[PDB]
Design a protein around this ligand. Structure first.
Ligand SMILES: Nc1nc2c(ncn2[C@@H]2O[C@H](COP(=O)(O)OP(=O)(O)CP(=O)(O)O)[C@@H](O)[C@H]2O)c(=O)[nH]1
Ligand SMILES: [Mg+2]
Ligand SMILES: [Mg+2]
Ligand SMILES: [Mg+2]
Ligand SMILES: [Mg+2]
Ligand SMILES: [Mg+2]
Ligand SMILES: [Mg+2]
Ligand SMILES: [Mg+2]
Ligand SMILES: [Mg+2]
Ligand SMILES: [Mg+2]
Ligand SMILES: [Mg+2]
Ligand SMILES: [Mg+2]
Ligand SMILES: [Mg+2]
Ligand SMILES: [Mg+2]
Ligand SMILES: [Mg+2]
Ligand SMILES: [Mg+2]
Ligand SMILES: [Mg+2]
Ligand SMILES: [Mg+2]
Ligand SMILES: [Mg+2]
Lengths: 62, 85, 690, 122
RNA sequence: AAUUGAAGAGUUUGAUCAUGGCUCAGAUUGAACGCUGGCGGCAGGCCUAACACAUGCAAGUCGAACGGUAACAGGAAGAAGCUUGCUUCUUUGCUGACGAGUGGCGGACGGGUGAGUAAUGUCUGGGAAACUGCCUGAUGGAGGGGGAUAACUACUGGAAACGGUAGCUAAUACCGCAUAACGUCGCAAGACCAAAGAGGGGGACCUUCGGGCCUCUUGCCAUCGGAUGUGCCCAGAUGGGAUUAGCUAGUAGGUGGGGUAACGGCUCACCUAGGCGACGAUCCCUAGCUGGUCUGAGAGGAUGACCAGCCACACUGGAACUGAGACACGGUCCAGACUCCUACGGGAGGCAGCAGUGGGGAAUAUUGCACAAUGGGCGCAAGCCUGAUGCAGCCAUGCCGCGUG
RNA sequence: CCCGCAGAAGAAGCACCGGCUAACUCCGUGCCAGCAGCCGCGGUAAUACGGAGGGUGCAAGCGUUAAUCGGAAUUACUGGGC
């Protein structure tokens, strides 16, 4: 299946092992799932600060 | 199998061989009676029935045949030994 | 609970060049120590090929061959010879305390002896020495001893002398206790009768290298002051003397013997307890605190310190799961104590514990400092991690990761297996940090990398055996590029779509010209040298986009276009019909025809290449760099080797390691990274046709 | 006496069932294989699971021939049918893991030990 | 007092009303993942592969059934080094006790799993032809004989698993004989059926001085009850499919034989030609059922983890033997797939018991402590066994508390 | 479980703030980068993207996903239509 990769930027290439989420993209007919950032071989969104729980970004060092 | 109460296996075997042999002859005696009926000999039927009655009863007691079976044999053997004989 | 012997601990690892007996010699121990033998190459592959592939740890108890000693507890690690698996020595020398460097009575030092030497020095690990195979033709004890001096720039001290050589090798001379030790016929070892020196060697025997005793002297001057004063030193004070200096690695005792004839291995064990450290004869560990800063973690070699250990070597046994070998430097762990992986910021809970115990995975509930063992069931503990006390967190030194020298691309033979090939290569990675895997950002093929041809071989072989993924292998692909060579004068693009719908018409005239490698990010230059207003500046962004599109994979053979510049000069529009799209196509068309006439060429990538080689063969190495279609650029003569500098193409460096080795007897690092793109020679170019 | 063509039964798992000899290896013009010789093989039958599949090309060890075997003294052993143990193409060495039906003493080879260790007879 | 509670919103249009789907607020979860994470209480924790399994444990127990001595201990049908009432050696099973063996009872409980089973089961309500260990009420019996055999001893084969010949021995093991009704067959007259001893103590009388003998406590046999358990029968309910319409030879009934604890085509021979199905037979697909769980105002819809009842299964197919009870989860036999041991001739094993590994997966835990308690097996008891159970360890998985002032 | 000891000492995250929906501004961005359960935001003054300040809701959890019923009278016996 074809699946969305949300957030600004990603690693993710031909052999990346990912975790697929479920949840459509109503601009992309046929794309009915998201790829869960920060899970397995997908990195979180670099430099993001808000809503970090989505996009798999860890708290930046208190 | 590594559970030493597998002596039960060697034990109940002695049992099977014992049971087998006793259970064998009480059958061959019941047979003798049916044979007489087929041969038609009223005398040997009632004779052979007399010989088999103690066997059937004793074994039932010893717990090899059980009670109601014992009954059923001498029951309908009788029925027949004096149905034409 | 209680413990028992402690501080009578001998953490020693045997390592040497290939053959040598560095394993045979190890099995011999387990026989001698195990009086009253679990082959040390117990991998299937490492039996098939007859070579140590993985470091193998066991323990056993030596009371000393004569009964002479209070029982000492010895942790042995038989390491690989070879390179390929050098990682198995970094770890196998970082952690443990002593080292028995074996040498072939016939084969001198030889290249991979030097490498393990450097690894011992890297970690300043004390060491003695055992010249094996004295029974073999061409055996020569003192010759090799001298090579340790000459080739390894170290200070040997013959702690012994060989009774004859090759097939006439009958015994050895303890030249401390000054007796010609005699091992007998049957029972292999054990027995003795400690015979005195024979008339043959009395002359030689009356040396010791008197600078043994003069080497023992140099411990302290007040220890030699009586030596100057001709006072024959007590046997007890010498052993302490040179041991004091073994520990301070200023001296390497040599012992010699022949594992095969059983004539020699035993005397060598004694030399271990005599002259190799306890875990306390040792600098306490260095380290850091967490966030904060340094302080040597210190942690004295003491049972009553806070627990701190390093994880060397990860494995997976099919019945107990993950095995994680560690060396406890300080404190203690009890089965259930939840220690801390400081270098991952997560805690682990110890469970079952196993010590490989000569030939049986014996179980343990407690593991003290100065010992080694493998922890079953630990979840995420890679090689190099520190397991410390959660209240007293510390990072420890962590050895070093050898850095691969070879790469090769692999594909999963059966397209089905492609998923599994992924799983397996991953597993082999966390087991071997000296091994690496990734996916080429361009030409997405799976690329593995290792310390050499053989390394790579048995990895792939290990996939078949353990993960049943067979895959064949090939040369990695190369990312070529495209450019033009001639500035091409005013080329013309035009659209004019009277068809049926949107009017649409764009006309553009431009100059395409090569660049020089300029401004990092671009490699592309668009210039708005448009007239006063032949095309409005609103459409000018578009014409740029149109060219931009054509650069993603140019007309020669796909492959990005680079180092191209473009200048607007002339065009035309309708007052309405023209549009972003219209000029975007016009540009597209303008790019073609212009490119055709511009003398296009295929680029190839070059590397800044740095070869580090001995003086002896800088001739061959240079010539090969040249043979490899290479340009040379410098030489230093940096200390002992000679760094050679060259620009040599990528599609041409494949499998360098393998041959660079052949040309320099194994002694030659090298390194490379990207530098530039240059024209590819024609036969190359026309070959690179997809 | 096996020779090119000739179906053989298989005396192991692996899953071959019926197999055809496509070459008697071991010499130019070598006519027959028998006893405990090696032959190139093409699988003709093959169970559904199995290590091997139909159409594969492997080697195999003649383990029972109907013409049988002699050896010393003058006796004979004859088997009713022809059977073999599939070998991996590179390493010889059974790809199977169990042997079925009796095998003979002649097979007492270094490489064929794994067969007689398995196998319920002679 | 105790099933007393029903909410709407966004979105088709320039706007409107209707129609109608998509969407949202709630509750819930054996959850998972991302970011984050202090404690406690109670509870829950392989939903996928009924996939394959290393290791240890999960079933024994009685010397008050018997011969008995391998080890322990004591005493000694008595003895050194002298450490003369304080030791460590040899004897003697004497006593305590106890390896192996016979014997008895248990191993059919306890625990696991959901594969199979759409009705061979489960549920509800009835029914008649049945057996039922230990526990219990009543009535009497418990006499007198015989042949064996493990262990053992002597030869002897194996690498191991296992044994092989010959001879010897005990009993509550085994078989006759007697005894024989309120038992069984039989209208009756009549025929016929069983069993076992063992311990604690003891006045006399006494004997081969073993104990007879006396007493108390148990156990043995028979018959009829009680209790509990189990088997069998009927009706109704308990999924979807007609893009399954026909189905049926032991088939439906009968008669007579046989058979079971028992009724019965249960089986067999013959005679009848029936029996089932549009109220869905047949054949396909899917599935353990229930108490209950979740939701809902209700009717409904969804569901069958954890607790309790019922059923089924025990590596796969199959079979019986022992027994009150099995066609037996840690029993036997055959066969198959598979794994393991071997000194190559030959052997062995089945975690869906607890813990645990690999594998699969988005995902599910310790190779823990203890029989102290409740309960189960054996035992007169003391006690031994008990991964049932009682606790702890792991995980924010849930619930409820409390803190971080 | 009680009794003593020292000192605030060792202990706060997570989603949201265009309408549905409790919570608004500046900056960056310029149909790009991106958001998005539904409608829909983004082409130079974006409360919708991303950062900040601020706020709102929950709190040792908070979100996202998956799942059953509900709203759905949208299979309507209760309780619908042609
Ligand atoms: N003649 C003789 N041969 C010896 C002696 N010691 C070892 N060998 C032989 O050297 C050979 C290799 O032995 P080995 O232990 O494998 O050396 P190694 O160090 O393990 C090789 P690797 O580097 O791969 O580990 C063996 O054949 C061994 O018998 C010796 O003292 N005399
Ligand atoms: Mg070699
Ligand atoms: Mg080796
Ligand atoms: Mg050599
Ligand atoms: Mg006993
Ligand atoms: Mg009688
Ligand atoms: Mg009848
Ligand atoms: Mg009848
Ligand atoms: Mg099922
Ligand atoms: Mg409804
Ligand atoms: Mg079965
Ligand atoms: Mg029976
Ligand atoms: Mg089992
Ligand atoms: Mg996994
Ligand atoms: Mg609002
Ligand atoms: Mg703005
Ligand atoms: Mg925002
Ligand atoms: Mg409804
Ligand atoms: Mg309607």
């Amino acid at each position: 299946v074809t699946s969305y990769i949300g957030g600004e930027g990603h690693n993710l290439q031909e052999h990346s092992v990912i975790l697929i989420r479920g949840g459509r993209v109503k601009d992309l007919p046929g794309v009915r799932y998201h790829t869960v950032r920060g899970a397995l071989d997908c990195s979180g969104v670099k430099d993001r600060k808000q809503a970090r729980s989505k996009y798999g970004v860890k708290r930046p060092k208190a | 199998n590594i559970k030493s109460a597998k002596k039960r296996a060697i034990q109940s075997e002695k049992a099977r061989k014992h049971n087998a042999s006793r259970r064998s002859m009480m059958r061959t005696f019941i047979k003798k009676v049916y044979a007489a009926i087929e041969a038609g000999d009223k005398a040997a039927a009632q004779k052979a029935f007399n010989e088999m009655q103690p066997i059937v009863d004793r074994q039932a007691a010893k717990g090899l045949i059980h009670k109601n079976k014992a009954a059923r044999h001498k029951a309908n053997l009788t029925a027949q030994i004096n149905k034409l004989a | 609970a209680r413990t028992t012997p402690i501080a009578r601990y001998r953490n020693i690892g045997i390592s040497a060049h290939i053959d040598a007996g560095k394993t045979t010699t190890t099995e011999r121990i387990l026989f001698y120590t195990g009086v009253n033998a679990a082959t040390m190459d117990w991998m299937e592959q490492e039996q098939e090929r007859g070579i140590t592939i993985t470091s193998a740890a066991t323990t056993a108890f030596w009371s000393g061959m004569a009964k002479q000693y209070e029982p000492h507890r010895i942790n042995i690690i038989d390491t690989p010879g070879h390179v390929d698996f050098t990682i198995e020595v970094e770890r196998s020398m970082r952690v443990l305390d002593g080292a028995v460097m074996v040498y072939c009575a016939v084969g001198g030092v030889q290249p991979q002896s030097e490498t393990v030497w450097r690894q011992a020095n890297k970690y300043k690990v004390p060491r003695i020495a055992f010249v094996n195979k004295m029974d073999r033709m061409g055996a020569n004890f003192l010759k090799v001893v001298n090579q340790i001096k000459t080739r390894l720039g170290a200070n040997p001290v013959p702690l012994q002398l060989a009774i004859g050589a090759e097939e006439h090798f009958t015994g050895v001379v303890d030249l401390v206790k000054m007796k010609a030790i005699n091992w007998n016929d049957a029972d292999q070892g054990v027995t003795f009768e400690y015979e005195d020196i024979p008339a043959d060697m009395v002359e030689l025997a009356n040396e010791w290298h008197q600078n043994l005793i003069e080497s023992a002297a140099e411990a302290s001057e007040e220890l030699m002051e009586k030596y100057l004063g001709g006072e024959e030193l007590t046997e007890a004070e010498i052993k302490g003397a040179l041991r004091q200096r073994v520990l301070n690695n200023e001296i390497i005792l040599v012992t010699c013997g022949s594992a095969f004839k059983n004539k020699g291995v035993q005397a060598m064990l004694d030399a271990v307890i005599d002259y190799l450290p306890s875990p306390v004869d040792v600098p306490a560990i260095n380290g850091i605190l967490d966030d904060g800063k340094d302080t040597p973690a210190e942690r004295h070699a003491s049972d009553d310190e806070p627990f701190s250990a390093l994880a060397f070597k990860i494995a997976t046994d099919p019945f107990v799961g993950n095995l994680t070998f560690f060396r406890v430097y300080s404190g203690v762990v009890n089965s259930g104590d939840t220690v801390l992986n400081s270098v991952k910021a997560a805690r682990e809970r110890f469970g079952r514990i196993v010590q490989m115990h000569a030939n049986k995975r014996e179980e343990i509930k407690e593991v003290r400092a100065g010992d080694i063992a493998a922890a079953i069931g630990l979840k995420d503990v890679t090689t190099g991690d520190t397991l410390c006390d959660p209240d007293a967190p510390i990072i420890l030194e962590r050895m070093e990761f050898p850095e691969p020298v070879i790469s090769i691309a692999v594909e999963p033979k059966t397209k089905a297996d492609q998923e599994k090939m992924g799983l397996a290569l991953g597993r082999l990675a966390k087991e071997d940090p000296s091994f690496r895997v990734w996916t080429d950002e361009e030409s997405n093929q799976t690329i593995i990398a290792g310390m050499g041809e053989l390394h790579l071989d048995i990895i792939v072989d290990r996939m078949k055996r353990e993960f049943n993924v067979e895959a064949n292998v090939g040369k990695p692909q190369v990312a070529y590029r495209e450019t033009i060579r001639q500035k091409v004068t005013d080329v013309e693009g035009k659209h004019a779509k009277q068809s049926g719908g949107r009017g649409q018409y764009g006309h553009v005239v431009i100059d395409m010209y090569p660049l020089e490698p300029g401004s990092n990010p671009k490699g592309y230059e668009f210039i708005n040298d448009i007239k006063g207003g032949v095309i409005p500046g609103e459409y000018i962004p578009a014409v740029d986009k149109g060219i931009q599109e054509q650069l993603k994979a140019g007309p020669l053979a796909g492959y990005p276009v680079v180092d191209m510049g473009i200048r607007l000069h002339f065009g035309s529009y309708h007052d309405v019909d023209s549009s972003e799209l219209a000029f975007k196509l016009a540009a597209s068309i303008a790019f073609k025809e212009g490119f055709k006439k511009a003398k296009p060429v295929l680029l190839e990538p070059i590397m800044k290449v740095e070869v580090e080689t001995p003086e002896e063969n800088t001739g061959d190495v240079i010539g090969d760099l040249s043979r490899r279609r290479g340009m040379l650029k410098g030489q230093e003569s940096e200390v002992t080797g000679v760094k050679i500098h060259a620009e040599v193409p990528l599609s041409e460096m494949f499998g360098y390691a393998t041959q660079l080795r052949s040309l320099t007897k194994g002694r030659a690092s090298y390194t490379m990274e990207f530098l530039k793109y240059d024209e590819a020679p024609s036969n190359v170019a026309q070959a690179v046709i997809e | 006496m096996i020779q090119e063509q000739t179906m053989l039964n298989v005396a192991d798992n692996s899953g071959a069932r019926r197999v055809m000899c496509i070459k008697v290896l071991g010499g130019s013009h070598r006519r027959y294989a028998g006893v405990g010789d090696i032959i190139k093989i093409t699988i003709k039958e093959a169970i559904p699971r199995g290590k091997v599949k139909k159409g594969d090309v492997l080697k195999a060890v003649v383990v029972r021939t109907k013409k049988g075997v002699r050896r010393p003294d003058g006796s004979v052993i004859r088997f009713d049918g022809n059977a073999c143990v599939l070998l991996n193409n590179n390493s010889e060495q059974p790809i199977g893991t169990r042997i079925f039906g009796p095998v003979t003493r002649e097979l007492r080879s270094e490489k064929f030990m794994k067969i007689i260790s398995l196998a319920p007879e002679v």
